[PDB]
């Protein structure tokens, strides 16, 4: 595999990969990791 990889590069047609969200004052990080990766993969896998 390459020695470095950055999804933001490979798929610069998928804006969400570069987006950083805010969990505020709530331990929601479990949801955040999940929906952010899920948003990415919807565009990566998009026919």
């Amino acid at each position: 595999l390459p020695a470095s990889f950055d999804a933001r590069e490979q798929w610069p047609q998928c804006p969400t990969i570069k987006e950083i969200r805010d969990q505020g004052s709530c331990g929601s990080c479990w949801a955040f990791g999940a929906v952010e990766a899920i948003s990415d993969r919807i565009c990566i896998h998009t026919n």
Binding site: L1, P2, A3, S4, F5, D6, A7, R8, W11, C14, P15, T16, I17, E19, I20, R21, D22, Q23, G24, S25, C26, G27, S28, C29, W30, A31, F32, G33, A34, V35, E36, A37, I38, S39, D40, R41, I42, C43, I44, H45, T46, N47
Partner: protein, 205 residues
């Protein structure tokens, strides 16, 4: 074509299957919710983007900044199965579902392969006091006390100042860390980063 999938919707509507709302959850249960119920769109706070935008406002996490300081946790808002006024179509018909969901082995080669093949994953690591001071570079834990797990997004890898890293997105806004992203040591299961990684594949039509 692209969608911001709603954290609001998964936070508030998964229920006990995902754990306890704003007092913690189970990311593997979060990917199985999406596969079973789906997840609607929704943007960032006050964005008015999508079905269900996020309703908890931003704050400064451990940085100085203009926003209010962050409070402990708060109240998990509630599951409203309806979209905001102004958004169309209906909540049910804004659902997106997953085909499937899985664990990725605690192997940086396996984890480089998943991302490489399929795009970013979710992992989780133990946070220690020294983390919170993360401004730049490759993160390696020397001091501090343990503060629990932090579930993140891992979106690549590389080598910096001779250190092999993982490229991770945090959810503490853009003004913490490296513009809200960070690098943590790769290949040693550092702080558990390689042990708790889950992903899944979208369902297509």
């Amino acid at each position: 074509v692209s969608v911001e999938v709603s954290a609001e919707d998964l936070l508030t509507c998964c229920g006990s299957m995902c754990g306890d709302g704003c007092n913690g959850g189970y990311p593997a249960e979060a990917w199985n919710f999406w596969t079973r119920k789906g997840l609607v769109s929704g943007g960032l706070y006050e964005s008015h983007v999508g079905c269900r935008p996020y309703s908890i406002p931003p704050c400064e996490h451990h940085v100085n900044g203009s926003r209010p300081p962050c409070t402990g946790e708060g109240d998990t808002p509630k599951c409203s199965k309806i979209c905001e006024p102004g958004y169309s179509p209906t909540y049910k018909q804004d659902k997106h579902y997953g085909y499937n969901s899985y664990s990725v082995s605690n192997s940086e080669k396996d984890i480089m392969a998943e991302i490489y093949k399929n795009g970013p994953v979710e992992g989780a690591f133990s946070v220690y006091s020294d983390f919170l001071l993360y401004k730049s570079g490759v993160y390696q834990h020397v001091t501090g006390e343990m503060m629990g797990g932090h579930a993140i997004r891992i979106l690549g890898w590389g080598v910096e100042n001779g250190t092999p890293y993982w490229l991770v997105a945090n959810s503490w806004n853009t003004d913490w860390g490296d513009n809200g992203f960070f690098k943590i040591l790769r290949g040693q299961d550092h702080c558990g980063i390689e042990s708790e990684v889950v992903a899944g594949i979208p369902r297509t039509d």
